[PDB]
Amino acid sequence: KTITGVFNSFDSLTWTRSVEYVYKGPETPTWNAVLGWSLNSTTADPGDTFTLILPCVFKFITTQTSVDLTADGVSYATCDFNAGEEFTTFSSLSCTVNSVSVSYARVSGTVKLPITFNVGGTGSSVDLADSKCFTAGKNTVTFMDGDTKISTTVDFDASPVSPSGYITSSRIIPSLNKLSSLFVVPQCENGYTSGIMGFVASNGATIDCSNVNIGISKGLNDWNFPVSSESFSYTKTCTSTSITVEFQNVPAGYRPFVDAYISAENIDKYTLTYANEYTCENGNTVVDPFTLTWWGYKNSEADSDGDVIVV
Numbered sequence: 001k002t003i004t005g006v007f008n009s010f011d012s013l014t015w016t017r018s019v020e021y022v023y024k025g026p027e028t029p030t031w032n033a034v035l036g037w038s039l040n041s042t043t044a045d046p047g048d049t050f051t052l053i054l055p056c057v058f059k060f061i062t063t064q065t066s067v068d069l070t071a072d073g074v075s076y077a078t079c080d081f082n083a084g085e086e087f088t089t090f091s092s093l094s095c096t097v098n099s100v101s102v103s104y105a106r107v108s109g110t111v112k113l114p115i116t117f118n119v120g121g122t123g124s125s126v127d128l129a130d131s132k133c134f135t136a137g138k139n140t141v142t143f144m145d146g147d148t149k150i151s152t153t154v155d156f157d158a159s160p161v162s163p164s165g166y167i168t169s170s171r172i173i174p175s176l177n178k179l180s181s182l183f184v185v186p187q188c189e190n191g192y193t194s195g196i197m198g199f200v201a202s203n204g205a206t207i208d209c210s211n212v213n214i215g216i217s218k219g220l221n222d223w224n225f226p227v228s229s230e231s232f233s234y235t236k237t238c239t240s241t242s243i244t245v246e247f248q249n250v251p252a253g254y255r256p257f258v259d260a261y262i263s264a265e266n267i268d269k270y271t272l273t274y275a276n277e278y279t280c281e282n283g284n285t286v287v288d289p290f291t292l293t294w295w296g297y298k299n300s301e302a303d304s305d306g307d308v309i310v311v
Contacts, residue, residue, distance in 0.1 A: 004146020120225020123213025
């Protein structure tokens with residue numbers, strides 16, 4: 001049977017500052033959620049299942065496929081990771097109660113979950129919906145186990161990047177071994193007469209034209225991500241090495257953007273060249289191309305006990 005209410009508290013949510021990562025953004029690795037759980041052997045049997053819901057969580061930052069609910073060296077349950085990614089706005093754990101060698105009436109413990117939150121990234125239905133998940137500063141993060149809501153407070157820093165200029169972002173989608181990559185045109189106060197937005201991939205990256213989004217968004221969220229996407233006047237061309245969108249007559253209040261999936265020979269190293277041309281309405285054409293090299297810190301099934309890599 002499926003049981004609910006196993007997870008019963010949200011104990012802490014804290015961000016781990018590393019060398020690669022600078023500020024406590026919601027999408028920045030790594031957030032650690034400590035959750036409380038309790039099992040009662042009169043209402044839970046070995047093989048029964050239960051799930052934890054993580055609204056607004058893109059993925060788990062781990063090489064493991066599962067995490068156990070353990071206390072004092074005993075594994076009471078095994079919980080498989082199911083990242084939301086671009087498929088659902090939430091991630092989850094699907095858990096199974098384990099048989100144990102002790103007999104308990106009631107047992108309780110905690111589990112630590114390494115996560116990043118989803119506050120936008122692409123024009124997909126998933127990312128647009130999660131773009132409204134949080135605002136800058138203090139938030140309440142709520143997870144659910146059936147009808148049980150468990151929550152805690154956290155403080156999320158806004159992006160340090162100004163929203164006025166061009167915006168770029170890329171994010172690994174672990175289950176696909178792809179990245180999404182986003183470009184938002186610099187802001188024009190009075191709409192745009194015209195523009196060319198997009199990027200050309202090199203250094204072993206190619207563009208996946210079957211997963212692109214082109215839209216105008218009514219402004220950007222606290223992390224510079226599209227919050228809406230409407231159609232508008234543009235033509236596009238997508239090839240294995242470039243996506244190029246030429247647009248016309250976009251109204252004031254809106255930001256054109258373009259995003260695509262990227263297949264990289266090395267998911268941790270690739271280079272994009274961005275065309276970045278735009279002519280604000282009443283104004284003259286700006287041509288400001290630039291190049292970025294994107295660096296990643298994803299690990300291949302590391303883990304962590306008995307698997308090691310030959311040189």
